Design a protein around this ligand. Structure first.
Ligand code: ATP
Ligand code: MG
Lengths: 30, 76, 176, 441, 32, 70, 290, 140
């Protein structure tokens, strides 16, 4: 449940990188 | 010599600077000077001696500060 | 909340809106006869107009007791909410155990029966992992540290592209 | 048969079931304020847990809930700020008497919702006669404390407070809203100030008009001051501080009004010194100085450090257009005291940064033997929001505390200082302002 | 052991805050 | 690994892989590494020597092996 | 203990462990301890650096206290989430994000007098979708006079570039006249009131769309992480996670005496209290001191 | 043109952060995985360790090639030439020494594990990308 601790900053101001729709509702419907 | 600064000097900015710059000539030498301006420098100066330069400008003191703390947070 | 609050016994709720709890206030000019009735119990006191004003003097200031954090619990509640959408489509799986009898075993092609017994072993693989809800709390910790580093921005925690583009229009379309 | 703790368990089992609606969670909250249930925090937590879960919300149950959150003094920012979703969808559906309770409760909690207060002020100026004077003050308290500097409403409220005279509690909400907006309109403050010798019934609205006058620096009222001296037991220790701070800033010196107020806050700090904010411990030290009424020996020495703490904390978190102004004023203070070249002004303003006696750091602190002056830059956040633009009462707060430390505070405000064209004009503006305060320089 | 507090139970647990404090206690004394 | 090199070099230098066609010595030792005991490699790796308690015990375990042709 | 520049930064902070360090400091100052004189030292580059590492100790526990509005419908959970990050900015010493990123522009481009260099070292802070739509207009106006467009403002060679970049700013949706007429201002307080009410109508529709784009990326990451995990057998999952849990404990156990490692293993002990306190009464929850 | 001196003899980053990375001839990484973290710059021209800093080469380096480990065996600390004509298998002897160390490093204690460095001088870049593909697939 525990995470790696990170101490670093974000210097850019970017878009947050929306990941793609994983095919699992369409694989479990198959 | 050639001294490049950010904006043109005072008469006291001239006198405090030779006290910096005759410690860059290693004998009983006299510096003449040549005064140029560059606001790419953020204050301080660049002394150019045609065989060496010394950059006590704060525009490079920023970059020499940033790369010191961009190296040290990666060492911790 | 602020330091001074200016509500209480003026423009107040006079009556309840439900039936689960029965509220009756009786406002005079100075005090009020409230009568509350919830379940079998009843209570009726006298609230002064300057007794409700002292209520907002020391604030409650509720705060959430989380297992790890409020951020993590909101990601884990979303993964629990997403596991429910996948469990709902394992709810609509045909009962393959109605075809386990030997009158389906021996009428069927030997390769279409091995596919049927593999498709039944597959449902138990899918169903035993979608109900592994003790694994959602460690999947939420794979979302937290990359999110938390985007919030450690050197500009602002709440900065984004639409604001920082709108403030480039002010910076560029003014003089130098 | 009169069962108050046995009806708390019957309310607890109403909100601990699975599908509590809006009306059942409104009336559970309304019943917890009329019963005055500050001691049970978990029962207030179960109500606001179901108040976020409740999805349908008609006009009456939203305002009964938001009334109960505001009146009960319960704050949870996540729950209340998501109740602004029902509100902006029920906003044409709201009564004018109901819209005042929504915007007062959502504004008083600090909900940053610009779509709410824009539509809720455009309603209250489209139908300005439809709102009674208590409702135009509740909206004005909400839009002010929700971070909107809507002066279109503050004018339309000012025309109402001039046409009809209002209740004491109605005026003191309107004074508190104009104090945060920093308006100090003489035309409308004095129209609300006549409501305070008909007799006020709360001490919370005598203390809030006290705070709102001193923050705009008008002066004391002599019946607000004399309502506060009788009923300073009704006030919480964080509320009696803001009464005494607001009386000190307005120039009251009724020391028996200050013995009543400091009789609340002194045994509270003695019982738990961390009970108050360090912003409120500093507002005590301003009040324990300008009026001069002293405190216990363990308290007044303790709030003297917490003026030093709360002054560096606002200097560390300086607005960076205030950091531009201080380094501009300090450079003009170098040129005024004689420095025509840049190595002189660079090494003079590094000598102006002496430490205060309480542990703090002053930015432009000149010392000539015994006489010390202090130059104070007052940017724009400490100015009023109106066109004369005198500084707020908090700058006279900071001045009189430093003046009682061996300084002579010269105020340099940026509405006057930055209308000046060059550094020589700004040097004699500072030099006139220093010699107007201590002419030994 | 039971019934800790409220103000001790309000802490977010696996935040950094102490890597941030650690790399601030070995950078500011090193760059001064 | 070094223990399967020396076992295969043992099978050729102790005369266990004549009577075998010279074309399929490549396939003969693929049996020999796989058909002898997977526990006899662990002893040779841990000792580093083929001990007297093992050089007979492996050469008698290099007889219970099936080689191609034979 | 705290180094007295931390405790000045935790006064307006409102998380738990920063306020209990403040409250035990204010309890020491009630028992007559002297408030240490804060430093009028640490010149401008060091003051900017330790402010950056003191704001990030107010931001970092504060981000973990803000519930993401994942899978919610409406604008008010996203406006709550944005407003909690605004107040976290103000508690940590930041100004408004408009005032914070504009300071980042004018600091990064204090040396530049040409627009092609302004559009090049403000690259990290504007969209590449917007940095390109200004570089198309710039390299057409520099293909019109065949000289670099200057960052001067009074140059007419900039004036018809800024009139075309204003046409780009509407082509994104940004009200370029409204944003300019706010950060400039007006004389009367009534005509500047109507332009603040339509800047803040843009601004609230701006920062909601950055928060909602942040939520839609956490929603898409978590739905991608789950569907990769729902395709595993359960025996793989329990040992992938026990391997990752145990490797992360020994990274905190081999760390000798570091403050983060003691606080790490103190929070593992506090999670195990939470699981044990719930097991004692599950319809009640965890036991708080009341 | 102006050429400035850097004051430093030629150096490269050494340390454990170079493991797994493909660097160029001066240590700058060319695999496109960011900067070399956890690394330290040391000189490339060092005086070799002298007589009093050595000891006898006694422990074996197992190549995994049984023509080598039987006939021409290699100790740890020994330079061994692989000489031959073109396309005679000189890299294959060298690659199999690297791949075998991965198989041996999973079985030995932490003290005696062999960390390989492969310097590819003057080769194709395609030949090098085929080797880091093999070394990633094998786990080496
Ligand atoms: N032990 C082996 N068994 C079978 N085939 C091999 C063996 N060693 C090498 N080969 C094959 O022979 C070819 C030549 O091998 P390799 O590339 O190792 O030679 P090289 O000495 O590196 O030549 P060069 O560097 O001159 O190209 C390779 O294609 C490889 O597939
Ligand atoms: Mg080769």
């Amino acid at each position: 449940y525990l995470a790696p601790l990170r101490s670093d900053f974000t210097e850019e101001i970017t878009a947050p990188k929306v990941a793609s729709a994983s095919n699992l509702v369409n694989e479990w419907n198959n | 010599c050639t001294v490049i600064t950010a904006e043109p000097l005072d008469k006291l900015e001239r006198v405090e600077l030779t006290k910096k710059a005759e410690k860059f000539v290693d004998a009983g030498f006299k510096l003449v000077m040549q005064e140029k301006i560059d606001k790419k420098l953020l204050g301080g100066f660049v002394i150019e001696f045609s065989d060496r330069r010394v950059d006590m400008s704060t525009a490079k003191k920023v970059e020499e500060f940033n790369n010191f703390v961009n190296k040290l947070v990666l060492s911790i | 909340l602020t330091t001074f609050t200016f509500s209480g016994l003026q423009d107040a709720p006079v009556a309840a809106l439900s039936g689960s709890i029965k509220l009756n206030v009786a406002a005079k000019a100075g005090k009020a006869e409230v009568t509350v009735a919830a379940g079998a119990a009843k209570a009726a006191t006298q609230v002064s107009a300057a007794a409700l004003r002292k209520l907002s003097g020391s604030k409650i200031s509720l705060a959430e007791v989380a297992r790890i954090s409020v951020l993590h619990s909101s990601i884990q509640n979303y993964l629990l909410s997403l596991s429910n959408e996948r469990y709902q489509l394992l709810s609509q799986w045909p009962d393959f155990t109605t075809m386990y009898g030997k009158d389906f075993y021996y009428r069927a092609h030997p390769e279409d029966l091995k596919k049927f017994y593999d498709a039944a072993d597959e449902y138990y693989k899918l169903y035993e992992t979608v109900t592994e809800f003790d694994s959602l709390s460690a999947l939420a910790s794979q979302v937290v540290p990359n999110y938390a580093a985007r919030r450690r921005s050197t500009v602002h925690p709440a900065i984004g592209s639409t604001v920082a583009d709108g403030a480039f229009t002010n910076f560029l379309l003014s003089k130098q | 048969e009169n069962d108050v703790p046995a009806i708390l368990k019957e309310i607890d089992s109403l909100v601990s079931r699975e599908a509590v609606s809006a009306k059942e969670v409104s009336d559970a909250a309304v019943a917890l304020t009329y019963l005055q249930v500050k001691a049970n925090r978990r029962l207030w937590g179960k109500v606001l847990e179901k108040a976020g879960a409740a999805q349908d919300y008609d006009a009456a149950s939203l305002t009964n809930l938001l009334w109960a959150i505001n009146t009960g003094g319960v704050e949870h920012f996540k729950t209340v700020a998501e109740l602004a979703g029902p509100a902006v969808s029920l906003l044409p559906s709201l009564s004018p008497v109901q819209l005042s309770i929504v915007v007062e409760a959502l504004g008083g909690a600090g909900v940053k919702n610009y779509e709410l207060y824009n539509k809720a002020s455009a309603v209250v100026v489209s139908k300005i006669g439809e709102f009674k004077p208590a409702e135009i003050a509740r909206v004005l308290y909400g839009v002010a404390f929700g971070g909107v500097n809507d002066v279109a409403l503050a004018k339309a409220a000012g025309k109402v407070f001039a046409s009809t005279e209002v209740d004491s509690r109605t005026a003191a909400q309107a004074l508190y809203a104009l104090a945060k907006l920093g308006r100090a309109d003489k035309a409308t403050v004095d129209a609300l100030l006549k409501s305070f010798k008909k007799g006020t019934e709360s001490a919370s609205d005598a203390a809030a008009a006290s705070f709102a006058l001193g923050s705009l620096s008008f002066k004391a009222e002599k019946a607000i001051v004399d309502a506060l001296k009788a009923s300073a037991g009704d006030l919480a220790p964080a509320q009696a501080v803001e009464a005494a701070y607001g009386l000190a800033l307005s120039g009251a010196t009724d020391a028996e009004a200050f013995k009543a107020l400091f009789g609340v806050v002194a045994p509270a700090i003695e019982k738990a010194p961390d009970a108050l904010e360090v912003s409120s411990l500093a507002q005590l030290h301003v009040a324990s100085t300008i009026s001069g009424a002293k405190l216990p020996a363990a308290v007044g020495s303790f709030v003297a450090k917490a003026f030093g703490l709360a002054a560096d904390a606002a200097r560390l978190k300086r607005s960076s257009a205030e950091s531009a102004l201080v380094a501009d004023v300090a450079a003009a203070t170098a040129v005024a005291f004689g420095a025509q070249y840049r190595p002189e002004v660079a090494s003079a303003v590094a000598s102006y940064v002496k430490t205060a006696p309480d542990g703090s750091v002053l930015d432009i602190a000149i010392t000539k033997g015994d006489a010390k002056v202090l130059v104070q830059a007052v940017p724009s956040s400490l100015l009023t929001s109106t066109t004369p633009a005198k500084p707020l009462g908090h700058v006279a707060a900071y001045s009189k505390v430093r003046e009682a430390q061996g300084y002579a505070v010269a105020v340099v405000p940026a509405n006057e200082f930055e209308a000046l064209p060059d550094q020589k004009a700004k040097a004699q503006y500072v030099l006139a302002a220093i010699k107007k305060v201590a002419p030994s320089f | 052991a039971d019934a800790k507090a409220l103000d001790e139970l309000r802490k977010p647990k696996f935040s950094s805050k102490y890597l941030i404090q650690h790399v601030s206690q070995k950078l500011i004394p090193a760059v001064k | 690994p070094i223990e399967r090199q020396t076992v295969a070099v043992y099978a050729a230098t102790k005369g266990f892989l004549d009577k075998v066609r010279v074309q399929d010595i490549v396939a003969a030792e693929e049996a020999v590494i796989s058909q002898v005991n997977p526990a006899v490699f662990k002893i040779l790796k841990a000792n580093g020597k083929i001990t007297p308690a093992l050089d007979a015990h492996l050469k008698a375990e290099l007889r219970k092996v099936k080689l191609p042709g034979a | 203990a705290v180094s007295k520049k931390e405790v000045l930064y935790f006064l307006s902070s409102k998380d738990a462990e920063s306020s209990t360090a403040v409250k035990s400091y204010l309890k020491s100052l009630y028992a007559g301890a002297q408030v240490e004189a804060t430093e009028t030292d640490a010149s401008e580059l060091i003051a900017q650096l330790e402010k950056k590492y003191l704001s990030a100790q107010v931001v970092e526990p504060g981000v973990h206290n803000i519930a993401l509005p994942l899978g919610e419908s409406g604008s008010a959970p996203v406006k709550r989430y944005a407003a909690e990050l605004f107040n976290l900015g103000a508690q940590a010493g930041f100004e408004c994000p408009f005032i914070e990123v504009s300071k980042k522009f004018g600091q990064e481009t204090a040396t530049s007098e040409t627009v092609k260099d302004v559009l090049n070292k403000t690259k990290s802070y504007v969209s590449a979708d917007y940095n390109a739509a200004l570089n198309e207009v710039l390299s057409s106006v520099e293909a019109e006079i065949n000289g670099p467009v200057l960052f001067d403002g009074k140059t007419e060679g900039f004036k018809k570039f800024a009139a075309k970049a204003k046409a780009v700013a509407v082509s994104r949706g940004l009200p370029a006249d409204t944003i300019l007429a706010y950060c400039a201002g007006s004389a009367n307080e009534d005509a500047a009131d109507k332009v603040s009410k339509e800047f803040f109508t843009w601004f609230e529709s701006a920062y909601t769309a950055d928060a909602a784009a942040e939520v839609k990326a956490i929603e898409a990451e978590a739905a991608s992480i789950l569907d990769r995990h729902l395709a595993k057998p359960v025996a793989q999952i329990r040992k992938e996670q026990a391997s990752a849990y145990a490797s992360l404990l020994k990274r905190a156990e081999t760390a000798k005496g570091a403050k983060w490692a003691e606080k790490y293993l103190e929070d593992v002990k506090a999670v195990q209290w939470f699981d044990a306190s719930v097991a004692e009464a599950p319809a009640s929850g965890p036991k708080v001191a009341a | 043109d102006l050429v400035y001196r850097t004051g430093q003899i030629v150096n490269v980053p050494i340390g454990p952060g170079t493991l797994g990375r493909v660097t160029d001839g001066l240590g700058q990484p060319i695999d496109g995985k960011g900067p070399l973290t956890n690394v330290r710059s040391s000189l490339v021209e060092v005086k070799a360790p002298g007589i009093i800093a050595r000891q006898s080469v006694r422990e074996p380096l197992f190549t995994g090639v049984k023509a080598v480990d039987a006939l021409v065996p290699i100790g740890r600390g020994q330079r061994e030439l692989i000489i031959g004509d073109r396309q005679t298998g000189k890299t294959a002897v060298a690659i199999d020494a690297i791949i075998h160390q991965k198989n041996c490093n999973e079985q030995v204690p932490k003290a005696q594990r062999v960390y390989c460095v492969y310097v590819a001088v003057g080769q194709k870049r395609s030949t090098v990308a085929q080797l880091v593909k093999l070394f990633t697939q094998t786990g080496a």
